């Protein structure tokens, strides 16, 4: 048995495009991703997701919808990363580059999988189909998946 730390991940998914950010430093640097980070004490997971979206992309949204949960394990790290994944289609300002992230829109036939975390190839298609999911991925380093599980669920 392992302990887990809470993280959020937010995808702004519109009918023809999705907003990603190029991570400029830190964990996952060099990969396009949604926006997110560690949940803080006292806030709900959804509110931590809203906060991270604002801090990293400049976008302020009233509500997010939970679409999945993914647990990450790394060889040599005792602590699991419990990532709660949220979407919205509804925004009302422009993204702005932060120290963490350079936002960029991608058309939905140009999802930059080769420059995303390798596990995203498995679960992101479910997100695009508006399905809900639970996943688990064990990584050796940044690139290599040793074990994983992915399941569609009716309730996250
Ligand atoms: N798409 C995708 N996202 C992931 C994976 N693993 C993983 O931690 N994430 C997300 C969850 C968080 O949004 C982010 C990791 O949190 P972070 O290190 O950016 O947290 P933070 O903003 O609190 O960090 P910092 O500013 O203190 O350095 O990456 C993955 O394999 N695929
Ligand atoms: Na952050
Ligand atoms: Na972050």
Residue numbers in the entry: 1 to 156
Sentences copied from the publication:
In the nucleotide pool, which is more susceptible to oxidation by reactive oxygen species than DNA, human MutT homolog 1 (hMTH1, human NUDT1) is the most prominent mammalian enzyme among other enzymes responsible for sanitization of the nucleotide pool. hMTH1 is characterized by broad substrate specificity as compared with Escherichia coli MutT; that is, hMTH1 hydrolyzes different oxidized nucleotides such as 8-oxo-dGTP, 2-oxo-dATP, and 8-oxo-dATP with almost the same efficiency, whereas MutT shows high substrate specificity for 8-oxoguanine nucleotides. Accordingly, hMTH1 prevents mutations and cell dysfunction by its hydrolytic activity toward both 2-oxo-dATP and 8-oxo-dGTP. Here, we carried out structural and kinetic analyses of hMTH1 and demonstrated that hMTH1 shows broad substrate specificity for 8-oxo-dGTP and 2-oxo-dATP because of the exchange of the protonation state at Asp-119 and Asp-120 depending on the substrate.
